[PDB]
Amino acid sequence: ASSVNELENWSKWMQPIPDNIPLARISIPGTHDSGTFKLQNPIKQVWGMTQEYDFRYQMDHGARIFDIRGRLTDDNTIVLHHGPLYLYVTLHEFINEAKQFLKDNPSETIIMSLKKEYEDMKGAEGSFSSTFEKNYFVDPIFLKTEGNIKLGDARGKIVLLKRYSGSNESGGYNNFYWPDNETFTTTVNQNVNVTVQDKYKVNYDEKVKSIKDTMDETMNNSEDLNHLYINFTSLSSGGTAWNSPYSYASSINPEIANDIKQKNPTRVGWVIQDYINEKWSPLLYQEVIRANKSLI
Ligand SMILES: O[C@H]1[C@H](O)[C@@H](O)[C@H](O)[C@@H](O)[C@H]1O
Ligand SMILES: [Zn+2]
Ligand SMILES: [Zn+2]
Ligand SMILES: [Zn+2]
Ligand SMILES: [Zn+2]
């Protein structure tokens, strides 16, 4: 029993999508620097804040991909950071929130990108990868298989997207060379072609066109089941009120959301945005989710 309207329940939108559809094919909203929502100091915010609400709000609003940046501590734990700044959020904090969300909504899956954001603290008994694997990944909540991961196998679990080196355990999407500030194409789990638009520090106009260009490619290659498209709409801070991630998101989110609304495509990729909220219309994450209508 699956209807297109079930995509409108932002907490269970993946439910109507078939088990055999690769996550790569699905158009999924994601949040950039997901754990920066606790930053209070205006100076820290203008430079590194990318979200206003916590993880559950993000999830309840359709986001299923999270950009987690961590640092290994002397306590053999991983805490979230933005460069040298501790975000007052921990990795366990995110996983627990994800666990709760998945328990409440078992039809969904959570894709967690994990990147080492800052140098390890002195005193850790191991490495970033060995500590994450031993104290976190062992948890049954993490999918342990790879390949072109299908939705059915991911439901109720966290799917890892590695952005760190040294992994020694199978599961999720393998780490791959990720060039700096570019739109690039490469491969991951042997059979998945990946294209990423991550020009995080280009001028505003270059960024908008970059997002649209990669989305245009995605919309016209909608039947490529083993191709993964990740499109970051986020743009790094200029350090001022008129060029902070917030100011940029205020215009980019509605702009790109309108592109999808007008075009009404069957695929737009994994769209990772800053500031998921309901302040700007059309809502990007909603339009991204609605782009899965043809899969039902
Ligand atoms: O500041 C940037 C931005 O967060 C990009 O999205 C990420 O891919 C880069 O690694 C980071 O340096
Ligand atoms: Zn929290
Ligand atoms: Zn300590
Ligand atoms: Zn392809
Ligand atoms: Zn809301």
- The experimental technique used to determine this model is X-ray
The Cα–Cα gap between 46 and 43 comes to: 6
What is the resolution in angstroms?
2.0
HSE, side-chain direction, 13 A CA sphere, residue 67 = 25
User: End-to-end alpha-carbon separation of the chain, Å?
Assistant: 10
Residue position matching structure tokens 């899965």: 292
Q: How far is the CA of 87 from the centre of ligand 3 (A)?
A: 16
Q: Please state the three-class secondary structure of 122-187 as a single string.
A: CCCCCCHHHHHHHHHHCCCCECCCCCCCEHHHHCCCEEEEECCCCCCCCCCECCCCCCCCEEEEEE
Residue-by-residue DSSP string for 69-104: EEEE-TTS-EEEEETTEEEEEEHHHHHHHHHHHHHH
The torsion angle over the Cα atoms of residues 198, 201, 205 and 211, rounded to 10 degrees, is: 10
* Structural domain 1-296, CATH architecture: Alpha-Beta Barrel (3.20)
Residues contacting 49, CB < 8 A, separation 6+: 36, 37, 39, 244, 245, 246
At residue 66, the 3 state secondary structure works out as strand
- Work out the angle at residue 188's Cα, subtended by the Cα atoms of residues 269 and 136, and round it to the nearest 5 degrees: 90
HSE, side-chain direction, 13 A CA sphere, residue 268 = 29
Cα 73–chain centre separation: 24
Nearest CA to ligand 1 atom 3: 200
Q: What are phi and psi of 238, to 5 degrees?
A: -100, -5
Name which of 287, 295, 282, 258 is nearest 271 in CA terms. 287
- Work out the angle at residue 155's Cα, subtended by the Cα atoms of residues 132 and 178, and round it to the nearest 5 degrees: 50
CA distances from 29 to 163, 268, 281, 283 (A): 19, 10, 16, 11
Q: Is 82 labeled as catalytic in the residue annotation?
A: yes
The Cα–Cα gap between 155 and 109 comes to: 5
Q: How far is the CA of 193 from the centre of ligand 4 (A)?
A: 5
